[PDB]
Amino acid sequence: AAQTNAPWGLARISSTSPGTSTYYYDESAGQGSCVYVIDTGIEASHPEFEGRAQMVKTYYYSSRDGNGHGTHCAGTVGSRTYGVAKKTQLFGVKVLDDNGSGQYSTIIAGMDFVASDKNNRNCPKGVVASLSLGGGYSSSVNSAAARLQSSGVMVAVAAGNNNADARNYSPASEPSVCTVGASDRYDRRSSFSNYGSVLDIFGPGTSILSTWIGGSTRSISGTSMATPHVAGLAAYLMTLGKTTAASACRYIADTANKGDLSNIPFGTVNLLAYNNYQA
Numbered sequence: 238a239a240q241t242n243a244p245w246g247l248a249r250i251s252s253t254s255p256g257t258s259t260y261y262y263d264e265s266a267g268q269g270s271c272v273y274v275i276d277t278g279i280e281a282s283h284p285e286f287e288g289r290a291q292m293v294k295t296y297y298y299s300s301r302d303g304n305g306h307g308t309h310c311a312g313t314v315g316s317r318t319y320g321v322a323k324k325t326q327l328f329g330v331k332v333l334d335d336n337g338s339g340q341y342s343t344i345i346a347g348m349d350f351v352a353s354d355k356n357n358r359n360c361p362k363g364v365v366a367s368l369s370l371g372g373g374y375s376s377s378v379n380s381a382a383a384r385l386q387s388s389g390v391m392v393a394v395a396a397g398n399n400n401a402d403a404r405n406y407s408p409a410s411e412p413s414v415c416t417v418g419a420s421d422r423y424d425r426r427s428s429f430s431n432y433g434s435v436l437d438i439f440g441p442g443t444s445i446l447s448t449w450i451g452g453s454t455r456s457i458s459g460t461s462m463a464t465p466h467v468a469g470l471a472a473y474l475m476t477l478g479k480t481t482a483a484s485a486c487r488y489i490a491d492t493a494n495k496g497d498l499s500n501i502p503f504g505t506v507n508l509l510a511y512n513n514y515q516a
């Protein structure tokens with residue numbers, strides 16, 4: 238399959254070079270897999286989701302995304318125009334309020350919910366979790382991400398937008414999960430993107446165009462935008478039978494584009510997400 242005039246993000250994860258605008262992917266496109274978006278909720282009624290998105294848990298007065306961040310992350314995972322896996326199932330777990338903030342206890346409880354709610358969903362191809370949040374370091378948040386990873390879910394987390402080492406940020410410091418850095422369309426490390434030895438993969442993070450709330454679309458930046466790229470890629474590689482939950486982050490790093498990113502600090506992996514699809 239080929240999507241012309243696609244955002245630079247998906248075209249990059251399907252290219253060995255920058256500057257292309259065509260996303261190439263296998264027509265399975267994530268069918269049979271599930272991706273849990275743990276954010277500010279998902280506007281499920283957006284036509285770009287085609288009835289594949291739904292709110293399964295909220296810790297507040299409403300499950301509706303009053304912010305747009307969670308809807309933007311879900312659009313990068315599996316929207317019809319801005320998604321990696323255009324056929325996957327999106328489950329919204331609203332652990333952040335409409336202000337984007339959230340207590341660590343609520344966010345931890347959201348991860349434990351996904352570790353058990355996946356037993357209630359139909360995901361024969363695999364379960365992925367997109368954690369496009371994070372804050373200061375916390376062993377409880379790190380253990381909550383490791384528990385979700387040990388339960389059989391591919392956990393992709395954001396490295397953070399502090400331009401520092403991701404070792405002082407949770408769940409970015411958890412070594413068992415996939416810590417995703419950000420990159421721009423010119424194969425440079427995003428100026429805000431965190432780094433360090435704990436990072437596993439870089440993804441398109443700067444000027445990522447995806448869906449917004451109210452049936453609209455907009456372009457934003459952040460490692461919160463590169464995480465759904467890897468999350469959608471893990472679900473894409475899952476239905477194709479290339480990898481499993483405990484080995485997707487390791488497989489993505491193995492088949493990634495090596496030595497193509499600039500401004501990568503010493504000791505940080507120079508890996509960019511690449512679906513390796515040969516049309």
Ligand SMILES: [Ca+2]
Nearest residue numbers: 412413414437
């Ligand atoms: Ca890791």
